[model samples]
Target chain A: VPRGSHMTLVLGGIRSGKSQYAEQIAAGFGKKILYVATAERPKSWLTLECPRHVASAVGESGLLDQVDGVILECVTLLSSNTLYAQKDPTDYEPFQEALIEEIEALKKLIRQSPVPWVLVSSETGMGISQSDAETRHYCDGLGIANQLLAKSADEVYFMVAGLPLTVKKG
Target chain B: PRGSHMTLVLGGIRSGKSQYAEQIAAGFGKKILYVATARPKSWLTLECPRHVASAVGESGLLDQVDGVILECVTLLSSNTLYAQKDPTDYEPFQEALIEEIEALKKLIRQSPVPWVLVSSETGMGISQSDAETRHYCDGLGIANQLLAKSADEVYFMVAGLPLTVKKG
Candidate 1:
């Protein structure tokens, strides 16, 4: 919703093919595509290989450069790693707020800057239950942000097993 | 006023309402019970998902919160995956709000510590026929309503701005 005339809300399970579907849609647009990814790499990457394992699985390629992406235009692609910043649920409120602002600003820029943009966000809301209140709050926050984007976007999708289901269409 | 009362905050995604709610909850200076109601299985990557988990594992907020109750809203199934619901709809996912209110009711029965609820206001301006979508909206509404009636405070957020909608 931030930067694209048409937006899709992709909801799905882990490895549900949401990202791949997003990429396919982007590729289908036949325009310069820019992928906006929100997943941040762990600061303690060496400290946490789990993080790397998780990150490694995200990209279209095994490497970070050719990662999973959404196309906004024919020539542009947006990846989660590039736009995403690390977040700690302990202090997630601040980080979430900051991220929302950044996205909102980017949306405005995309609207005015003349670059067709497509944004991608994982529907973390539908995932596993949170263990703690803080995490629950984070999940809730994600739901709110996702909704905000979905409400205004032209198209909204929920990916299931790499299949795209149209939730909203204009 | 009542030593840091728990506040329930709600807003759509990108509302920055969680930060506002957390600020208020932290102000109480008491242990927090962070309740999470999300569908767990539908994930593309475990990176952010794990990041979220590690960030708020059973022992919450590192040092701030005393405990957390994380529940998965969704589980794998043959048909369309379900969004979690508070009152188990027997669908795919659990409704966060329903379960949260029920949990909170139990919480009140156990302790008197202030509880802050931060939830997403999704599908606000859209039309969703799917039972999951409708159930999600209903769950959140029920959860917030119960909290506002029971909790010390309730707040609404828009465009990163927070406004107190109810207070007791």
Candidate 2:
């Protein structure tokens, strides 16, 4: 949790140990941990399964006030979940606009939150070109999502094969 | 080259791996042996796509060259993976690929020319439907990881920007 820091962002690919390392940090607090998960995610852990309503729950209800620290397990999955929930999977423009709004709104929520937030997300779009529209949209969405939050995060870490490389920090 | 050194430049398709490697070698302001196995007149291109270690070691061009760029490990790795007796299994091909890295490392250990190795970082993406495709990426990640350990410096390209994984 690092009470010394307000927000920390972690990004990596699948199996790159993004969640594992984040949990390692969360466990460091040795206090009540709010493990808000989007994807099983614990004891002294108030786990919430609000895949879509994390920001709303935190903003409207002040969910952070109850816990010592907050762990938003992931955003890429949440983004993909929303992308699939839309009426038309083929139409990404509207979804992207909405996606931006969701993230922007969430960013504002985090800025005003009282507890330290540890964000787990994916770094996509660095691969062979995908021809399909949905995959392309998923990549672009997650790609921009990471960069935006990373710029705002107090600390940033990029993981590779379960190892953390400091991308940005004091 | 400024001094004898080894570097690994890694990225996915079109992620600026080639340009960064060339940029380093070109900055040396001397003859560049591009074991591309393509780009500038200053580049003395060698077309050894396979058996690259032997090509670089025996070409007798190291004396004239100030540095070397070993590009396209994926092609060499794919070559061995496709030549496997059982395509379903990737261990044998991976073994061969590791052996190739060892061979390249051996030459690098003995050679005086500064070297820049370019490879694809292919594992950080969505899953592939085909088992073979997935395993192919698995092997590339292995190669990149191994090379990263031996590389004097390591950089992962993102949006044509270099993220310094290791400065050592």
Candidate 3:
């Protein structure tokens, strides 16, 4: 829930066309788009990645100039990247305080964005049992991050097989 | 999708979506046929470790319904695809599943009452690391999409709430 900005969280599984759906929504905002690319660089949009300090970097980059909307392609990738960037990959802490801190900062950054923002993330809470402890831990962290964003966002949609099911609306 | 006769009930584990589906079917106040696709717990413990216990309710109304409730298509798809002795011959196995779907369709078509079907939306969660798991998910996905296309009403359940995806 951005105080003065529009925030929408689009969630789905792998290959569920969640990114495309998010992009389409951003396009609907009818503004110059600036993608906060967390994953690999996808062409056709201005992209930037600040795994360590996205909140500070995006604010300082002057990227929002003339930008009508900002899209954080995903929270999962950014959280994971930020998690492993500082701590060793082998660490098995189930609830990563660092990741939670990062998400809190992201919420602030999203609220501070000059225009409407869309956050894209994968839904990681419903399927098969994770085989390894580390992956499970990662999922727990992402799940927490998703809940935080979903609770605060003005709109929430869970995409499935390319279909968007609105979970919450402002 | 059925032409005003079929409904698809989807949910994740402990989502409370199943209870709402049962309530809808019970509201029909007709004879119901409960088609359970899940294998017994003992069997699952021996064959599939990923599956937990299913907490299905609605047995008390089983005696007073003239319709059908297919408990799930996911477990059926898994049993048909993964539980086979020869996991290598998945092509023929898939063909068998198609035939099974046809049989299900015929059963649904000839039924003299409304139906409430149940199935898990399995692809939106944890990613497994095996060819068989992927195949199972693919098979379930195909089956769900097909049924959703054919179903008159489609509901996706999240956190115990039903969000209608399609309605006729």
Candidate 4:
């Protein structure tokens, strides 16, 4: 499966070595790498490590403006959709609506961009089952949404332990 | 003001799933909303009161409700998540339940708060369901698609336990 103008969705659990595997594949493309970052700032300890890992692997400085060939997009602050107190870390109510608009716009850009796109998204359906209605609802939507994106891409990969398993190679 | 993100959760029954998810949400002080999809049957149910009790007792839930509204073409109005049961519904087509699920996802994407979802894993089995029941499987497939895209993480539950299936 020789890949040329195809979209490959790289997936894995947090810290599962997916990022390393994905970076290697992107580097191998031998072309301009367009990294679509989906990370948010002020994340948990576990969440903080990934952005750093990607930066070092791609030979970049800090996240966002520091990275090259990388366009950062936030689905929500800290990557969550939940209501909370004003000072609460997960209080995303303020920006959820706007973020949606931004994602839609970014998606349009991705579709139109001439460069081969390499989208990196978090796999949100692997851990223990959740109970909360809102949490469950959020998870459910996420599952459907990601599938649509992967479907349009030329290829897809679900990574595990920094191991790259090619789901599709165009 | 628009928030940054949203997420969904999926798993099987007795996966100790919800408890683990609650912990993740609580870690960020996010309000939890539990959506009960199981409708009461005449006199049959796989989940017992004890199971429900355990989830409630273990997970510190904040709010819960049902019903999703669909009002837009791309983004759902929450009601769209409520895919109704139609006698002529096809397998590949989007049903009421699927619509509701998808609609809620659109809302989540548009909403400011990041979300986590919980769904049952009824597809793992040797026996197959009737025509109507078979349609339910589509829910899992569709749900998986949207959830994976909308969330920073996803996990599967088993025997009242939890396993990390995907994450940011």
- The lDDT leader among the candidates is 2
* Alpha-carbon RMSD of each model: 19.6, 6.1, 8.4, 20.4
Question: Compared with the true structure, what per-residue lDDT tens digits does model 1 show for residues A19-91?
Answer: 5556556555443343433323222121111211222232223222232223421100121221234455455
Error at B70, model 3, angstroms: 5.3
- Pick by TM-score: 1 or 3, better one: 3
Best candidate per DockQ, number? 3
Candidate numbers, best TM-score first, in rank order = 3, 2, 4, 1
Descending-lDDT candidate ranking: 2, 3, 1, 4
When 2 and 3 are scored with DockQ, the better candidate is: 3
lDDT of residue A82 for candidate 1? 19
**Global lDDT of each candidate:** 0.44, 0.77, 0.69, 0.43
Q: What is the lDDT of residue B76 in candidate 4?
A: 24
lDDT for each residue of candidate 3 in A1-170, tens digit (9 for 90 to 100): 12233889999875555777788878766557788877633344677776666777788888877577788877878867866665565575524777887788878987776778888998887776677767777788888889999998999988764567788887
Candidate 4 per-residue lDDT over residues B1-168, each given as its tens digit: 114344344455556656665554544342334333341221111221222323432343312212111111112211222333453355433555455555555655544444555555443332133554445443444445555555556565657665565555
**Which ranges in model 3 have alpha carbons more than 4 Å from their true place?**
A1-5, A13-17, A40-44, A49-52, A90-97, A126-132, A159-167, B1-6, B13-72, B75-116, B138-152, B157-168
Q: How many Å off is the CA of A93 in candidate 1?
A: 4.0
Ranking by DockQ: 3, 2, 4, 1
Question: Could you tell me how far off, in angstroms, the CA of residue B45 lies in candidate 2 after the best superposition?
Answer: 10
